[PDB]
């Protein structure tokens, strides 16, 4: 049950390459092995500094195609992000390179230097969620307040807003899910309210 | 199919009390639900400071019992650690509370402050790592560095080690399983030789 030759060098050489790497020891990069085969590795990418991303940890799904080097592998945030190109609810990444312009000399190194470099500058006209997207370009303020608090209680981040995290235990007295009570609010303002009747649709 | 009611209930508040503590709030400690009915749960508890473990964040899988709070969660560690307490191989966990010193009034908040004082104060007299014991006992500082090192690697704090990560290097060098790699070396005295060996059994 194993890959093509070229697809197993590549992704052994790769494995190697993101643990011998200047970011890897400096904590900025890292990658584990799921599947014995190698069609499965976890990633993991620390917040970019100056941004509401820093403090953060996130974990990524890599699934290596039986076609590699020569399509992208398919990446997803397992740890929940509020980011105008990543889906707030399943993590999906829109990026270039995992598209259409990925390019046989990528690596898995340069991918997750590439998503920790699309978190420090998002593409809200070409997004995932464009829930976010919008709120990144409406209320930029409460994007990066939000993004903080995703951070906070999703990634390890400092801590956020005092003010969210009351609403959010506010709706959960109500007993509705923490999860869906966070991605609500988030997508209603945090508004109370509004947020509320959107858990009830 | 869910838990008989005393155990839901317990289970809900709970994990209301770890989120809203102040301990999660200083990213200490937190849980998140895995399964919809509550019988297992996922934390994640904040290496101590001035230990080998500072900097690393490590993941626990709970697993609560149709008996709860009668008798004790199943904790496990996700996130290899080097301990005397703690199986470097599958993460088992050697601790009063998880056998037979639990209490009807002990919590999940209680349970992770413990595993996180453990981290801080191990007792290797009744160690669950005989090879990890006996390490802590016999060379101190080999163990300081070896928990250090597998800190770095497998729980993300700083760096630590260069002569460490270039022996792990080399044995991969060969097509060794890193972690197989790197608990033969830890395993043995970080002897490139007998370590090598090990490899082969």
Same mark, same amino acid.
């Given at each position: ?11 052994? @050489?790769?494995?190697? $390459?993101?643990?011998?790497? #200047?970011?890897?020891?400096? /904590?900025?990069? +890292? !990658? ?24 953060? @940890?996130?974990?990524? $799904?890599?699934?290596?195609? #039986?076609?590699?080097?020569? /399509?992208?592998? +398919? !990446? ?126």
């Amino acid at each position: 049950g194993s890959m093509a030759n070229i697809a197993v060098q590549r992704i052994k @050489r790769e494995f190697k $390459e993101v643990l011998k790497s #200047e970011e890897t020891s400096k /904590n900025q990069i +890292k !990658v584990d092995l799921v599947d014995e085969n190698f069609t499965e590795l976890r990633g993991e990418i620390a917040g970019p500094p100056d941004t509401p991303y820093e403090g953060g @940890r996130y974990q990524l $799904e890599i699934k290596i195609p #039986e076609t590699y080097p020569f /399509n992208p592998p +398919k !990446v997803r945030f397992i740890t929940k992000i509020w980011h105008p190109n990543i889906s707030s609810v399943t993590g999906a990444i829109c990026l270039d390179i995992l598209k259409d312009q990925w390019a046989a000399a990528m690596t898995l190194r340069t991918v997750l230097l590439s998503l920790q470099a699309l978190l420090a500058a998002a593409e809200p006209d070409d997004p995932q969620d464009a829930v976010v997207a919008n709120q990144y370009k409406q209320n930029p303020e409460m994007f990066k307040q939000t993004a903080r608090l995703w951070a906070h209680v999703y990634a390890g981040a400092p801590v956020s807003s005092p003010e969210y995290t009351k609403k959010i235990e506010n709706l959960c007295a109500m007993g509705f899910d923490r999860n869906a009570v966070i991605v609500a609010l988030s997508s209603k303002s945090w508004d109370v309210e509004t947020a509320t009747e959107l858990l009830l649709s």
